[PDB]
């Protein structure tokens, strides 16, 4: 819309004064969080005067494989969308890869969920819309996937923006980050967990599991990680309780957690679902609820 068009042009104007990023140009502000393969810090870039989120990923790889990943992410320069986090640059230096992106002062919904206890349904409707629109942008404009939808990768800011991050843009970085330690939680669809055949329908599963988690404030499957993986493959999916949440939102997560990817809803069906069109009509003060 008019506001989103102005913010994107404003971000593109600030992005033009960035250029090349090097290690010596930064000063760390604070540590935002760390995960299975990376740690994120709030940094100040003195050459342009911009605050950014700097993700550091450690990788000992051959020189050719290292050069491939750096330019495999330059596609992010074309991922300009109100539901996708912006991109400044990425560079390697002495075993670690730094990825500079737009700072989100609200953090991830995983951090916001821990403070709120539970995220209200009206807020989750605005969240569901941005995730569907963000995935649709990546599928039609860039013909890739997200591969890693979860509350840890859904970022928010004071201005009320909802954007996504940490999706598969560099394929060998995907294979390189497979050499990682045993994770702590699972958000993969059972067919993704099982074997090779999969599609973008698993992203819908991962946000469906994310919606249920943020709605009740509890990881809904349930243990060591393998037992969780076996539960996703075997047992039926979780669902929200009956009395609390609306049947529209109940029917939304059930069609998003249907185990078969062919019976599960597509991004075209969820766009015109009863729960999505209802919350888009709702006027919710998302910026105020976050701040």
């Amino acid at each position: 819309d008019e506001q989103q068009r102005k913010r994107l042009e404003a971000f593109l104007t600030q992005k033009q004064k960035v250029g090349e990023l090097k290690d010596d140009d930064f000063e760390k502000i604070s540590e935002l969080g760390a995960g299975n393969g990376g740690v994120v810090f709030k940094v100040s870039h003195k050459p342009s005067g911009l605050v950014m989120a700097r993700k550091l990923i450690h990788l000992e790889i051959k020189p050719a494989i290292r050069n491939q990943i750096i330019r495999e992410l330059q596609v992010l320069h074309e991922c300009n969308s109100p539901y996708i986090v912006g991109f400044y640059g990425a560079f390697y230096s002495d075993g670690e890869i730094s990825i500079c992106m737009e700072h989100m002062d609200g953090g991830s919904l995983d951090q916001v969920l821990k403070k709120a206890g539970r995220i209200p349904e009206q807020i989750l409707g605005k969240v569901s819309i941005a995730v569907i629109k963000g995935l649709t942008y990546l599928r039609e404009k860039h013909k890739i996937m997200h591969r890693d939808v979860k509350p840890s990768n859904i970022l928010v800011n004071s201005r009320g923006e909802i954007k996504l991050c940490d999706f598969g843009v560099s394929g060998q970085l995907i294979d390189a980050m497979a050499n990682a330690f045993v994770g702590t939680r699972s958000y993969m669809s059972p067919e993704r967990l099982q074997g090779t055949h999969y599609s973008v329908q698993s992203d819908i599963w991962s946000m469906g599991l994310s919606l249920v988690e943020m709605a009740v404030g509890r990881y809904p499957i349930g243990m060591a990680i393998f037992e969780l993986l076996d539960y996703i493959v075997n047992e039926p999916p979780p669902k929200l309780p009956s009395g609390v949440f609306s049947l529209e939102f109940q029917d939304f997560v059930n069609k998003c957690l249907i185990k078969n990817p062919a019976e599960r809803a597509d991004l075209k069906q969820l766009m015109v679902h009863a729960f999505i069109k209802r919350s888009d009509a709702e006027e919710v003060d998302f910026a105020g609820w976050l701040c």
Binding site: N36, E60, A180, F181, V182, G183, L193, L229, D230
Partner: protein
């Protein structure tokens, strides 16, 4: 025990090597100083273990523990190894290794692991990154931060499941050694194209995925392929122990 503590006044730190954090240092010559500051009640028991495990190791194929520091924080002092890790030689620098050398590195690694198991030490974290080729000749096994006394690419299935009685065992170390054998004989890491981490976890844990032994080099002898596959077996009960691994390597070495 306490006779291995070193005052910080005697130790000098030089260049930072990487990330705890390792420094090249000076304490009666070149040393390595791993800075693991006020310890939590459990990490003190952890540092009490890696140091206690290292205090029980006196073998040419085990990284030489030299001392520890308690100030400003806990730190471990070891010998300074000249050269690179086996991971660096195989997956970074593309080092030209003869087949007799690859078998020798496999033999020395089994020599150190056999010593650890004879001391009732389960390394619990054997990988190519923790194997150093000192002076390009002698294997030095390190990183005992997870060792105990009695990534996923080197993890056995029973450890990835965490359900079976006593997941970590001698056999789980043997599988990790088997993946190291896969690196030596294939020159690459296992599952070097499957992008989904949890898939590897669930598939390997269930048995639906294993290292692809079709990438084994042509000059790898048949007895080395069988030893490789026997160390990678899904059921830990059938994987051989390091005394039998040594006898198998010493057998194939005896006749080219």
């Amino acid at each position: 025990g306490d006779d291995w503590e070193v005052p910080p006044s005697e130790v000098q730190l030089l260049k930072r090597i990487g990330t705890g954090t390792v420094f090249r240092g000076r304490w009666h010559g070149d040393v390595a100083v791993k800075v693991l500051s006020q310890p939590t009640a459990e990490q003190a028991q952890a540092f009490k273990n890696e140091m206690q495990v290292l205090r029980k190791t006196r073998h040419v194929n085990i990284l030489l523990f030299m001392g520890f520091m308690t100030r400003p924080g806990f730190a471990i002092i070891t010998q300074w190894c000249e050269g690179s890790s086996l991971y660096h030689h195989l997956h970074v620098a593309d080092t030209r290794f003869d087949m007799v050398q690859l078998i020798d590195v496999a033999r020395q690694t089994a020599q150190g692991m056999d010593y650890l198991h004879a001391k009732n030490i389960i390394h619990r974290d054997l990988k190519s990154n923790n194997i150093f080729l000192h002076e390009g000749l002698t294997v030095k096994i390190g990183d005992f931060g997870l060792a105990t006394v009695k990534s996923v690419l080197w993890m056995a299935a029973e450890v990835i499941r965490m359900q079976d009685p006593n997941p970590y065992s001698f056999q789980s170390d043997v599988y990790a050694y088997g993946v190291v054998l896969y690196e030596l004989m294939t020159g690459s890491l296992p599952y070097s194209h499957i992008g989904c981490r949890d898939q590897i976890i669930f598939m390997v844990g269930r048995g639906y995925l294993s290292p692809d032994l079709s990438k084994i080099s042509s000059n790898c002898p048949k007895a080395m392929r069988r030893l490789l596959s026997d160390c990678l077996k899904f059921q830990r009960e059938e994987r051989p122990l390091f005394p039998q691994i040594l006898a198998t390597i010493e057998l194939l070495q005896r006749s080219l």
